[model samples]
Target: KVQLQQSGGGAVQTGGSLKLTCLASGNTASIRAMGWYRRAPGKQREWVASLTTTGTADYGDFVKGRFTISRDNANNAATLQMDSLKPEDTAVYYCNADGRRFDGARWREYESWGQGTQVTISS
Candidate 1:
């Protein structure tokens, strides 16, 4: 019984930043890995960052400067730090992971996802 608990959505101002977190529990902590993705209400997904359960982590070019990524191995959570928020940045962000808890195997494709965090840039 794995679960990806996420932060609640709220309002943020332009030029500000936001940080989203996903807490993994049950087999999720040791089963697979996690990643952050952004997309419109009905658009394709854009990669941000990904971190495996083994602590291996990587960030996409989309997260080069204003974006930061980190994984807390001790707590089984992944964090996506974003700054310089723009009105276009107002989109749905999600925490996702594969569906494998073998500890040492491939988890296939993105199988699990959080309820998504909405960012409304205003002011």
Candidate 2:
């Protein structure tokens, strides 16, 4: 049973970048890819991207160039940085361990999540 804890400031300035950190406990980084998600007010959650302990990263088509994810496997933590922030970027961010089930090479579903942290972007 792995758990993720997120920490960061609550406010960020417009056009500035915000950094958040996620700490993983109860497991080793090599066993799972760290996943990130965003949920803005009045909107559904969206997958941001994922990163492996080995330094491989994959971003969603919608989030490309706006977000970055990095992991410090040695410390059992990961960081996400969003640059050129806007008011609309205010939202809750979450980091989770991948809980995917593969069927012979293709993923069928995911099965776990982390409690999210709220961040408000303002001028």
Candidate 3:
């Protein structure tokens, strides 16, 4: 059974930066790519970024700057670092992964997800 265990959340000041981590275990070699999705306060789910095994990442249009995703294949770990945070950035964040890709595109449904980490950004 594959599982993605995530770090706990904390409070951050607006305009500050933070980092979240996810560690994968149990058959982790099956994961082809890792991604992050978030649910903002009172808002629906949105994709933040996705990182491929090759170290390439795709970001959402609104992820203007200072947001990045990195992965470690050997350790089966992934990290999301964000800067210039705003109050609106407060949300529950999840780390997910899928084992497949299609025609060089990341279209497969995620096979596993971490227990969400509640992040609060205050002014």
Candidate 4:
């Protein structure tokens, strides 16, 4: 069974930056795409970014450059970094991964998830 653990996220004021790390265990060899997503209070989940095993990266339009994802296969870890944060950015961030992407699919169907980290912003 695959399990994910995440760290690094909490209360911070506006304009500050945040970094989060996710470490995966069990069957990591099956992971093809690692991704980051966030769900604001009472809002639907939003995609932040993803990094493929092929070294390709993708991001939501608004998250381009600012929200980034990277991996360390040796340690089975992935990192997400957010910059120029805003109050609206407050949310619970999660890390997920899957084996493949289907043709014409806009998003990947993740197979595992991490216990999310909550981020709060203060003015």
Query: Compared with the true structure, what per-residue lDDT tens digits does model 2 show for residues 1-113?
Result: 46678887478788888788888776453346887888999999988889875668988776659889998868787788888788887889888776445556886544446
Determine the C-alpha RMSD for candidate 2 after optimal superposition of all C-alphas: 4.2
Candidate 3 ranges beyond 4 A from true positions: 100-110
CA lDDT, every model vs. true structure: 0.75, 0.77, 0.86, 0.85
How much does candidate 3 score in TM-score? 0.87
Task: Please identify model 4 stretches exceeding 4 Å from their true place.
Answer: 100-110
TM-score of each: 0.76, 0.79, 0.87, 0.86
Error of 4 at 89 (Å): 0.8
Pick the winner on TM-score between candidates 1 and 3.
Answer: 3
| lDDT of residue 108 for candidate 1 | 38
lDDT of 1 by residue, 16-115 (tens): 8888988877775445668888786567878777777667777777555776767786887778888887776777889887654543565434367888
Can you write out model 3's per-residue Cα lDDT over 48-101, one digit (the tens) per residue? Answer: 999988777999887886688999877889999988988888999999988843
**Stretches of candidate 1 exceeding 4 Å from the true structure:** 102-110
Candidate 4: residue 34 Cα off by (Å): 0.6
TM-score of 1: 0.76
Residue pairs in steric clash, candidate 3?
Answer: none
- Weakest lDDT window of 10 consecutive positions for candidate 4: 100-109
TM-score of 4: 0.86
